[PDB]
């Protein structure tokens, strides 16, 4: 099944990547990934949305600001909330502010989300059907803080417990690496100085490598 190479960014539906800064707020850039393109897919349009109004507002739902937080309360809060403003109406500060929601500039919604089975096939076909989809990975070594070029493979990974969440825009294969050769295609939030522009490749079908299918969801529009 599926397309040997997905990238969602060839098709308009990702925005340039973006950096969090000092503030735990991964979760807040993954869901607004998602987010982005499935209004991309409905309407066409893509514009950038506000992680801001995720931080500062969605507290009811679980999330904790700059604490943490997970990618399914963010789709939540936006269906809770009848909505999300754009990055340009409600920027991003990176510090936990007052909620500043404004229905007035909602370009957003969603009706829910939709939780992946715990397997990479599973997630193979969601990118390869819906878009960008949220995961969450296992960031937490030094090979990733410092990762510059290549496939990422971490021996020490877990496939367990992850703690950054980010957006798969797509998967492929090394033609240079075909022994180990497939990749997912990973957007990050650290700017684009780290890895390969802001992005990453993490390793594919390598038994759920750093449990990069293990938390993988998307909001339904
Ligand atoms: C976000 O950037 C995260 O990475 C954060 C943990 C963390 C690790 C390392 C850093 O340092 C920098 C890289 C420099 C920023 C910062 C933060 N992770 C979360 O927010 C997690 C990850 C996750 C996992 C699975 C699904 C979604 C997201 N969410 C979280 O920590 O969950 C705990 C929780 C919070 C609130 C309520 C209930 C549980």
């Known amino acids: 099944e599926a397309p ?9 539906y990702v925005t340039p990547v973006k950096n969090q800064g000092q503030c735990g707020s991964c979760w807040a850039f993954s869901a607004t990934g998602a987010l982005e393109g499935q209004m991309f897919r409905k309407t066409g349009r893509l514009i950038s ?6 931080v500062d507002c969605s507290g009811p739902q679980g999330n904790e600001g700059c604490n943490g937080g997970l990618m399914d309360y963010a789709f939540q809060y936006v269906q809770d909330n009848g909505g999300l403003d754009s990055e340009e109406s409600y920027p991003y500060e990176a510090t936990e502010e007052s909620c500043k929601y404004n229905p007035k500039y909602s370009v957003a919604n969603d009706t829910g989300f939709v939780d992946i089975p715990k397997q990479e ?7 390869a059907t ?3 989809i949220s995961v969450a990975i296992d960031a937490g070594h030094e090979s990733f803080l410092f990762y510059k070029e290549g496939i990422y493979f971490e021996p020490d990974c877990s496939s367990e417990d992850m703690d950054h969440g980010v957006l798969v825009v797509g998967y492929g294969f090394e033609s240079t690496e075909s022994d ?4 997912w295609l990973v957007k990050n939030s650290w ?7 802001g992005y990453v490749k993490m390793a ?3 038994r759920n490598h750093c449990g990069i299918a293990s938390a993988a969801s998307y909001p339904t529009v």
Request: glycine share 12%; charged share 35%; hydrophobic share 30%.
């Open 4 to 12: 040997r190479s997905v990238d969602w960014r060839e098709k308009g």
């Open 49 to 54: 949305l506000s992680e801001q109004n995720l």
């Open 130 to 132: 819906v878009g960008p």
């Open 204 to 206: 594919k079908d390598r």
């Open 180 to 183: 180990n050769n497939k990749y």
């Open 121 to 127: 096939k599973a997630l193979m076909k969601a990118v």
């Open 191 to 197: 700017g684009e100085e780290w890895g390969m522009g």
